[PDB]
Every structure is written in structure tokens, then in C-alpha cells.
Design a protein around this ligand. Structure first.
Ligand SMILES: CC(C)CCC[C@@H](C)[C@H]1CC[C@H]2[C@@H]3CC=C4C[C@@H](O)CC[C@]4(C)[C@H]3CC[C@]12C
Ligand SMILES: CCCCCCCC/C=C\CCCCCCCC(=O)OC[C@H](O)CO
Ligand SMILES: CCCCCCCC/C=C\CCCCCCCC(=O)OC[C@H](O)CO
Ligand SMILES: CCCCCCCC/C=C\CCCCCCCC(=O)OC[C@H](O)CO
Ligand SMILES: CCCCCCCC/C=C\CCCCCCCC(=O)O
Ligand SMILES: CCCCCCCC/C=C\CCCCCCCC(=O)O
Ligand SMILES: CC(C)NC[C@H](O)COc1cccc2ccccc12
Length: 442
């Protein structure tokens, strides 16, 4: 009906604007902001370019084909539009596959969160991705290797008013495997390992940076004490000069209340070392430390770092339950203390770690780990949007009558909307948030 055409036109127009303005904002943020110029952000630029080309040259011509119920652009632009459409989908999943592999080599290296590729090498990878995917998309379509031999297809090719994607059963299987399924199986398997390595490689140093935080300026403790860096207490006295005196002496320099990232790490490596030293000295804490595994030993050091050797020793009943490998009974007594009431969010994480003996409580807490979850959402959404289309595409090869034309176009458009979702998912990263609000002048 008339109301269904007007309504569809408005919706389709807003989808185009969201994809164009959205991906324009992403590319501009990376190109101007110095901190956003990383190897990982170079692959995101490749992904944003494909979504922008999709919203300017693919989605507009596809919208006109639905509203007019005919093709008014000829047979040359039909085959060229189809070639660009495929190239955009092929390059996007292969770019997401390269990110999964690069993030694996980085997490398994001593650099931990830095790509082993240079900015010059990454530029070559992105260029190779587009050149190779450009050949597998344009050549089988322009050479007419895709064309079906049935009468309904031959008539559509000859007609200048028909641009319906009719393919031979050989092309539909070969082009789906190499363009979509091959990078998808690799991307899923490789990135499931990246999430595994990150959780497994968590230590006491990463644990306390989550609980205590990192501040290079003298701040106020939850108990009103003077603190600097990763939970390093300066003094109990309410004197900023005495707090500056304890800081200026410990480093042996003119601090003036401000310290560097290299200086804060130097103090932390000494505090953790002293926390382990205190346990071996204490006769009540030492036999508990020996009966605990690697994960649970870190949970005890965390308590000593916070409350002190004498403080933790006061949990006479809880320490006994930990020594007898009774985790849930120790957990109830630890909850019934002033420690749980002072820092509930921190104590909840330490007590759960004593119960499970895993890093389940510190899941995606670290800033470097949150960046891995963000990339994981991008890969997940892309799979959720394009999988129903490619599955129905393979089912159509087995049995032709089961899938209707109206079902095919609807599933293809779910994949089209995905080109406008990626810029919204980049708002998870604080670096992009500050860049987006600057470009929008907010
Ligand atoms: C529709 C077709 C014809 C257009 C294809 C656009 C091509 C030329 C685009 C898409 C993605 C682009 C790349 C995206 C990311 C970067 C990182 C930057 O540090 C240097 C340029 C480089 C490597 C771009 C070069 C050009 C590129 C390969
Ligand atoms: C029409 C093609 C529009 C696509 C042209 C955009 C490609 C250029 C680009 O994205 O720029 C990357 C920038 O140099 C990163 O530092
Ligand atoms: C198959 C997919 C291969 C994708 C190519 C990515 C190459 C890469 O990530 O580099 C490896 C390492 O960083 C270099 O020492
Ligand atoms: C409505 C808002 C979306 C429109 C966003 C349009 C994208 C414009 C981005 C912009 O403001 O450009 C900055 C300019 O390049 C100076 O460095
Ligand atoms: C018709 C095409 C309309 C819009 C696409 C061009 C986007 C213009 C923004 C570029 C200017 C800039 O870098 O800030
Ligand atoms: C999410 C999907 C968003 C919009 C869907 C718009 C596409 C219209 C397809 C209708 C099917 C048809 O009439 O042929
Ligand atoms: C309507 C048509 C022009 N849209 C094409 C899709 O959005 C992209 O789908 C595809 C992408 C890559 C390979 C493929 C092989 C066979 C069939 C479809 C493929």
C-alpha cells in the first residue's frame, strides 16, 4: 500500500544517514587524534571504510530497487553494484579475522598488549586484504562465472530492468566458504584463545592495580589517609606537607606531589615484595600460605597489602577454614567483618577468588582486557547479523522452493544495518568517547 512505501522510504533514509555520518566520524577521529593512531585502530579504519562504501554506493541503490520494484540503472551498474557489495562483505570478515590473529600473537608475547607488527607492515596487510578480496569479488562476476543457466535467470540478465542475484550452485558454495565461512571459523577459534590467555595470565600485580587503582597525584583514602600510586599509603596525619615529605624522601627527588608512571611502578614492586615477606615472618599466616594454590596465594597477599600482616592474622577462624580447604565456610566469616563493610566491592572480589580459586571475579576489569571485550562485541555482532543470511543462502542450494524472495531481502538488510552499529560500539572505549565529543563540539 501507499502508506507502506512512504514509511519504508523514511526508515531506509535514516539507516543510510546513520552509516555515512557514523563511519565518517570514526575515520576522522583516527586521522586527527595522535593517541588513536595504533596498529589495531588501522584495521578498524579498514572496517569503517567498507561500511562507509556500503552506505554510500550499495545501500542507496538497493533502497531504490525495493521502493520502485524495478532496476533503473542498467546492466553495467547492476554487475558493478553487486561486485562492490560482495567486496565490502568479504573485506570486513577478513579484516576481523586479521584482528583475532594479531591480538593472539600480542597476548602470547612478552609485550602482552602491543602488536608485533609495525605501522608500515599493517598498511601492507590492509592493502593485501583489499587487493586479494577485490579479485575474488570482481573477476567471478565481471567474467560471468556466477551466472545460472535456468530460463528465469537468463531472461533477468538480458532485461535492463532486472537485477536479481541469480547464481549457479557451484558459485553459491565456493564463494560462501572462501569469503565468509573460512575467516569466520578461524576468527571464532583464534579469539576464543585470546580471552582464555588473558584470564590465565592474570597476576598479583594486575590484581592490585584493579582494586587499588593508579593515581600519580596525592589523593584521599576511603579512611581519609594520604595515598599515591597503587594503594601506597604515605601518612595517617592530616598534613599535606608531611605527606609530601614522606614522598620526597622515599623517591629522593623534588616530587611536589606529582610522580611518573615509571616511579609509581617502582614503589608498587617494593610494596608487593614487602607484603610477601611479612607472611613468611608471621607464624599464623605462613602455614595458610603453604596450603593455598597460586590463585588463592594472590588473594591472601591482597589482604596483607591492604590491612597489614597484623590485620589479616586477626581472622583466626577464617584462616583455619582456608587451611582445611573449606572455602564456603571461610567466606561467611570474612563477610561478617569491618573489612567487608569498609570496601565491599573489593572484599566481594577477594572472597569469591577464595571460593572458586579462579580469576572469574577480575573478568574484564583491567583497561587492556576491556579493549579485548570491545573487539569481541564487534566480531560477535557481525556474526549475529550476517549468519542468518549465509545459512539460508546454503539451504537454497539444497532445496530451491523452501526460501521466498521477501525472506532473502529481509535477511540481507539485517546485515546492512550492521554497517551503522560499529561506531556505537566504539563509544565503549574512553579514548573514542573524548574524540567523538570533541568533533561533535559537545
Ligand atoms: C570501492 C573501492 C574502489 C575503494 C576501496 C578503498 C581502498 C582504496 C581503501 C579502503 C581501506 C583503506 C585503508 C584503511 C587504513 C589505512 C591505514 C592508514 O594508516 C594508511 C592508509 C590505509 C592502509 C588505507 C588505504 C586505502 C584503503 C585500502
Ligand atoms: C569513495 C571512496 C571513499 C573512501 C576514501 C577514504 C580513504 C582514505 C582514508 O580513510 O584515510 C585514512 C587516513 O589516511 C588514516 O590516517
Ligand atoms: C590466515 C590469517 C593470517 C592473517 C595475517 C596476520 C599476520 C599477523 O598477525 O602477524 C603475525 C605476527 O604478528 C608477525 O610476527
Ligand atoms: C548529527 C551529527 C552527525 C554528523 C557528523 C558529521 C561528521 C563531521 C565530523 C566533524 O565535525 O569534522 C571535524 C573537522 O574535520 C575538523 O577537524
Ligand atoms: C553526498 C556525500 C555526502 C557526504 C560524505 C562526505 C562527508 C563530508 C565530511 C568531510 C569533511 C571533514 O573531514 O570534516
Ligand atoms: C533490520 C532490518 C531493517 C530493515 C528492513 C528493510 C528491508 C525491507 C525488506 C522487505 C522485504 C520485501 O518486501 O521484499
Ligand atoms: C543482493 C546482493 C547484491 N547482496 C549480496 C550480499 O549482501 C553479499 O553476500 C555475499 C558475500 C560474499 C559472498 C557471497 C557468495 C554468494 C552469495 C552471496 C555472497
Amino acid at each position: 500500500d501507499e502508506v507502506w512505501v512512504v514509511g519504508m522510504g523514511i526508515v531506509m533514509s535514516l539507516i543510510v544517514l546513520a552509516i555515512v555520518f557514523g563511519n565518517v566520524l570514526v575515520i576522522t577521529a583516527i586521522a586527527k587524534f595522535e593517541r588513536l593512531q595504533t596498529v589495531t585502530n588501522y584495521f578498524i579504519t579498514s572496517l569503517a571504510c567498507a561500511d562507509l562504501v556500503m552506505g554510500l554506493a550499495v545501500v542507496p541503490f538497493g533502497a531504490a530497487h525495493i521502493l520502485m520494484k524495478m532496476w533503473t540503472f542498467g546492466n553495467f551498474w547492476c554487475e558493478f553494484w553487486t561486485s562492490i557489495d560482495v567486496l565490502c562483505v568479504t573485506a570486513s570478515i577478513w579484516t576481523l579475522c586479521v584482528i583475532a590473529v594479531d591480538r593472539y600473537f600480542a597476548i602470547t608475547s612478552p609485550f602482552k598488549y602491543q602488536s608485533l607488527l609495525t605501522k608500515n607492515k599493517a598498511r601492507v596487510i590492509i592493502l593485501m586484504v583489499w587487493i586479494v578480496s577485490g579479485l575474488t569479488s570482481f573477476l567471478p562476476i565481471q567474467m560471468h562465472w556466477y551466472r545460472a543457466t535456468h530460463q528465469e535467470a537468463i531472461n533477468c540478465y538480458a532485461e535492463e530492468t532486472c537485477c536479481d542475484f541469480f547464481t549457479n550452485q557451484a558459485y553459491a558454495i565456493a564463494s560462501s566458504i572462501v569469503s565468509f565461512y573460512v575467516p569466520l571459523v578461524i576468527m571464532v577459534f583464534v579469539y576464543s584463545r585470546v580471552f582464555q590467555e588473558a584470564k590465565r595470565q592474570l597476576n598479583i600485580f594486575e590484581m592490585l592495580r584493579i582494586d587499588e587503582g593508579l593515581r600519580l597525584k596525592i589523593y584521599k583514602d576511603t579512611e581519609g589517609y594520604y595515598t599515591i600510586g597503587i594503594g601506597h599509603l604515605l601518612t595517617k596525619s592530616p598534613s599535606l606537607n608531611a605527606a609530601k615529605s614522606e614522598l620526597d624522601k622515599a623517591i629522593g627527588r623534588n616530587t611536589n606531589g606529582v610522580i611518573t608512571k615509571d616511579e609509581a611502578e617502582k614503589l608498587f614492586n617494593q610494596d608487593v615484595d614487602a607484603a610477601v615477606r611479612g607472611i613468611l615472618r608471621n607464624a599464623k599466616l605462613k602455614p595458610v600460605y603453604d596450603s593455598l594454590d597460586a590463585v588463592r596465594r594472590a588473594a591472601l597477599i591482597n589482604m596483607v597489602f591492604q590491612m597489614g600482616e597484623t590485620g589479616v592474622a586477626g581472622f583466626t577462624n577464617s584462616l583455619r577454614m582456608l587451611q582445611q580447604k573449606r572455602w564456603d565456610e571461610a567466606a561467611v566469616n570474612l563477610a561478617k567483618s569491618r573489612w567487608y563493610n569498609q570496601t565491599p566491592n573489593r572484599a566481594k572480589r577477594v572472597i569469591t577468588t577464595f571460593r572458586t580459586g579462579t580469576w572469574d571475579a577480575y573478568k574484564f576489569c583491567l583497561k587492556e582486557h576491556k579493549a579485548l571485550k570491545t573487539l569481541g562485541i564487534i566480531m560477535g555482532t557481525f556474526t549475529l547479523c550476517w549468519l542468518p543470511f549465509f545459512i539460508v543462502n546454503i539451504v537454497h542450494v539444497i532445496q530451491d522452493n523452501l526460501i521466498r524472495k521477501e525472506v532473502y531481502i529481509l535477511l540481507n538488510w539485517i546485515g546492512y544495518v550492521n554497517s551503522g552499529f560499529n561506531p556505537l560500539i566504539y563509544c565503549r572505549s574512553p579514548d573514542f568517547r573524548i574524540a567523538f565529543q570533541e568533533l561533535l563540539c559537545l
